[PDB]
Amino acid sequence: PHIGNYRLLKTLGKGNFAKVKRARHILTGREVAIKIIDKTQLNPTSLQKLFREVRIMKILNHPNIIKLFEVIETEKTLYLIMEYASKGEVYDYLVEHGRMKEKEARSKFRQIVSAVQYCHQKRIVHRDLKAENLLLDADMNIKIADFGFSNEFTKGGKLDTFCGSPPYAAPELFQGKKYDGPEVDVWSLGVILYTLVSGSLPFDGQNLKELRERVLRGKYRIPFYMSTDCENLLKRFLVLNPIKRGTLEQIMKDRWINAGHEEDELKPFVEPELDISDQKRIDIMVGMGYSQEEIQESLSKMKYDEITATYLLLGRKSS
Amino acid sequence: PHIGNYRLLKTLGKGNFAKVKRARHILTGREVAIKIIDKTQLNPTSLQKLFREVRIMKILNHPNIIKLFEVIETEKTLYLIMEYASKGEVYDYLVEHGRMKEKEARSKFRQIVSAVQYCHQKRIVHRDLKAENLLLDADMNIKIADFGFSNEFTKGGKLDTFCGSPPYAAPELFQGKKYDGPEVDVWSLGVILYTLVSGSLPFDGQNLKELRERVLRGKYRIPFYMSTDCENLLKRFLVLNPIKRGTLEQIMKDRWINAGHEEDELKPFVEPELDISDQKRIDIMVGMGYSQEEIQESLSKMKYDEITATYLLLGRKSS
Ligand SMILES: O=C1COc2ccc(-c3cnc4ccccn34)nc2N1C1CCNCC1
């Protein structure tokens, strides 16, 4: 079972109309995760949502966001070749091991906040931030995943409205209000921080009505083991009024976020320019069969084709 | 979800009338694999074979056979708490990485042969030996799994008949012939050796009729990279006449099995007496709440209950 330069292996997840398989790249031997989308069963509205997701993945390039390597498209199927995160979901990690100590939660949350603030720099809101969409690579680095519900947000625009996971949804979402975008992601990050440090959700209910009532009241329990600094940080995320909710760039200066990083304060990610001139990698690809000129054309136009994927995968360590 | 002293985690497999879930032992924190069988779906004949499998697992104690730690039984469900092998099936390993070099195949095959010869010492035939039932632990040690089709073999009797995986089945099984027991495992181990060294099955076909004819002819292709010693060893397993097939105790002396193993010739496993007197582990269990006397009674009578499982799990490394 091959597709392009990829040997398909075991299934990682199954949705309706899509599945995710682990795969090996034939030319480099690197492992990847491939989202396989059956286009035949999609209406034109779902199809445009699909191409929107691809456009967002091409915009985002951050070490803690799942990276897109290659797009293969047939009449029936779309293949999105992406990073593989071998240690799975933060959600499953919390279920198995319980709460993280604050030192470990801080390491993950600095990466999470950096990635999401970087999305907002790029005028993208994720809109479904939850523990299940935080992946972990082999070194336990965060990789934010599933931008299938994400969208651009615009000055003077309000978002078409949608509800991700209700436990992570801001109170304005329960009230059907229009919203700009980023403030809703900020609230979800407050819920995420609470789950990292406690192993549980701050707002829960036996049904949606009860959950909604608790979110709108905005009260949550502080466990005895939680530090005052962590409690104070949570107050900057879980503000009912979106106008007064902290922004991520402000929250990056928080004392808890930077404990043990006092000379390395968290700051907005600065995207480096992509090095497309590594002749060591180009020489390897010329040995494979691609011409020097083909490689420079694919890389300079950033085609997300078989050549740029090979070049990027050669820049990643083996497994 | 919990069952007894175990927190159930992700599903590892789902078959007909059973599933396998990874789990954590609450008292010790050790990971395990739990086979979960809905007894309500079984007829009395299936129920009989289920308790047969349990009896067989209690007989076998070998470092390269999946170990049974505990049995939990409710009116509706049977839980078999077993060793977890974190690196999965040899079958998937061959699919992903291709053939093993003969030195890597030799290390696995010595363990496989030791485990199966030990089964035959205990008058147990596995009857479904195949790449899918060879698991790999965190250190790539073999763990033979799934004794659901295994049986005792006896002097004077012939086996009830059953079909394992056709590609691994001995020729006499295709001809409906009665058989003693261990000779069919020996044939399957020849097929396994071939698949380890070549990455492919020796006998295949587009359908069962074609596969059957090739197995009965007993001819298979020797790749140019295979050593003469490996070719000669295969001839001792893949003998059409079960009467003339080598026994595993004889095959253990083969040059290929022992190449580079000076002062370490492969020989029948000698099962040591289980140390049930480790006062360091017992003291931990007394701290947990069990009484010293209860622990001695469960271990001395080897009950495979919550006490013996805890004692065994405390003797395993954290992972
Ligand atoms: O829905 C998608 C679509 O975008 C993805 C891109 C890459 C991966 C992925 C990479 N490495 C692994 C390892 C295990 C599971 C998924 N992946 N997954 C998704 N998913 C998962 C599915 C489950 N919840 C989290 C998101």
Ligand SMILES: O=C1COc2ccc(-c3cnc4ccccn34)nc2N1C1CCNCC1
């Ligand atoms: O059929 C059974 C029943 O006996 C078992 C006992 C232990 C485990 C097991 C232990 N560790 C792992 C890791 C991954 C998958 C299974 N396991 N499995 C089975 N199975 C597998 C399922 C797939 N085919 C090979 C046998």
